[model samples]
Target: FKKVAKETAITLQSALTLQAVRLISQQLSETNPGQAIWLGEFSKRHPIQESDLYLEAMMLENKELVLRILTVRENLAEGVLEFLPEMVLSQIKQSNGNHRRSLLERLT
Candidate 1:
């Protein structure tokens, strides 16, 4: 089951469609048996724009997962940054150097 879940996630990720994002988001929200695998695959292709999966992940309140999403790219869009919860925002603010600067710039 795990093997099939990973394979399915890979295929869905490669498709990169809005529908695929919804499917992944559903799986993640439901805490499916393959939740971790789906999240990993989605992270591997983190979208350039705000996505359903991104918001869903944020709502999951998984610190590690949220950090991975934020750090996937050095610069994130201001629109995307707007969605960052206070918890994650403060954590990022406490971090030093480029990461902090990048997010700060977006806010200013």
Candidate 2:
């Protein structure tokens, strides 16, 4: 099955990481199998969770699947995990402008 369908939509408030992907998959799997599977593979490839949207797009991308999974998050109240490790956050926060851009670019 495809990862995210045309209807799916994903909008990250902060950065992207394996922890976030895993969390999303856990929450979306039963309902959105496509996105979950794609995310699972994504986790395998990029588990660091330091990159951003564009970087993720450059590395591995499946827009259709991303859209499918993201659509469900329209009214998402839960943005980020309440208990996130500082290490992951640091990866995005501590970096410079270009580095942060690169990190965000890969958050798919």
Candidate 3:
């Protein structure tokens, strides 16, 4: 269909979406990699006053709670990260972005 077009146009937003789809669909890579990136980017794009990663760390210490919460989130995005303390949020500030994202990803 694209081949038949006399000209093609794609906005930066749409172009980014296409890239996200490809990256997320890569079977050889880790699951939720794109979702992780999306959540991290969303946080960066939108200012937030919380540390999603360290909150997840607390869940790590409680196996039962971790399992219960993951059942609710069903994925990293909606996990109960916002409820963690300010100290936890502060820890997130020290991490490299990918590490911050991986922390949440590992939780789910």
Candidate 4:
């Protein structure tokens, strides 16, 4: 039982890390590759506070930032979702500014 629990813990940690990496990669593709690469390397070196700063910068206008926060670490998902409504965030992710607003107006 103890061995099984230990193995599960490692697997869960790896999964979360992979999720964070993949999500960040997607943003990297959308944003500037060089900046992402450089910041990623720097975040890796620190891993304590630098990651938080990196995440803060990434969160600006990023509809998926809440989801990405979950993948990175912990205790932040609720905080982000508190300020950003999922409905609006979903719209932002699916379409651009004016288009999303138009769709929203139609839905109401």
Candidate 5:
């Protein structure tokens, strides 16, 4: 049933409700530092417009996690950038050297 379970997992991941995404994001943020970034990358690739849920789930509670994901600007959809809170953007603008210039230009 390994193959079946793997397919099931893929199906669930693809069809995850926003609530499921939020809960999963929260659990990953709390339990596995690395996995949260993976989720960010995964969401970027999948483009289900669920990025906001993941961001909101971690935004208030996990600044470091959010920063890590934001550092790799490519990992986020452009539309989702607007959802980033001002505090998060300010933090990124101050600390994210490589993305700083581009982020400023983009935001302006």
Candidate 6:
């Protein structure tokens, strides 16, 4: 039946997108705490090796996720500083004092 076929097609498309959402939400919640921090620190301490292609790719992916979390101020002091890579915070500290305070305040 035409109606049945259309319904199947609609569900098929939605199923994939729904799967994406499911995985993303699971990832977000999984890393929402402080787990993302450890992944970032590991990347720095153990720089990607040219010999290990898979590891390099995986490290980059993890860093991207960490960066995404940093983009939004989920938690101020703890997530902003403690979780944020020291290198990044060092650079941000170089900016103007009042401006930095304002930005952090907004996050808080």
The C-alpha TM-scores of every prediction are 0.23, 0.35, 0.20, 0.36, 0.30, 0.28
TM-score of 6: 0.28
lDDT of 5 by residue, 1-108 (tens): 599868754544334343345555787899885976777765665554445465566666656755555443333334343554686678886778767778888997
The candidate, 3 or 6, that scores higher on lDDT is: 6
Best by the lDDT measure: 5
Evaluate all candidate structures by whole-model CA lDDT and list the values in order. 0.53, 0.51, 0.42, 0.57, 0.58, 0.48
Per residue, candidate 4 scores C-alpha lDDT tens digits across 1-108 of 599878765555444544565566677868878756754664465432334444555565344753555546444343343554577678787779788799899999
Flag the better candidate by TM-score, 2 or 6.
2
- If both were scored by lDDT, which would come out higher, candidate 2 or candidate 3? 2
TM-score for candidate 1? 0.23
In candidate 5, the residue pairs with backbone N, CA or C atoms under 3 Å apart (3 or more residues apart, or in different chains) clash, namely: none
Q: Single out the weakest 10-residue window by summed lDDT for candidate 5.
A: 72-81
Off by over 4 Å in 4: 35-71, 75-108
- lDDT, candidate 1, 1-108, per-residue tens: 599878765543333334444444565676864765666575565552445466465556566545544444223333343554675667766776677688889998
Segments of candidate 6 deviating more than 4 angstroms = 33-108
Q: Per-residue lDDT for 7 in model 3?
A: 33
Q: Where does candidate 2 stray beyond 4 Å?
A: 1-16, 53-55, 58-60, 64-108
Q: How many Å off is the CA of 32 in candidate 1?
A: 16
Q: How far in Å is the alpha carbon of 101 misplaced in model 2?
A: 46
Ranking by lDDT: 5, 4, 1, 2, 6, 3
Q: What is the alpha-carbon lDDT of model 2 when measured against the actual structure?
A: 0.51
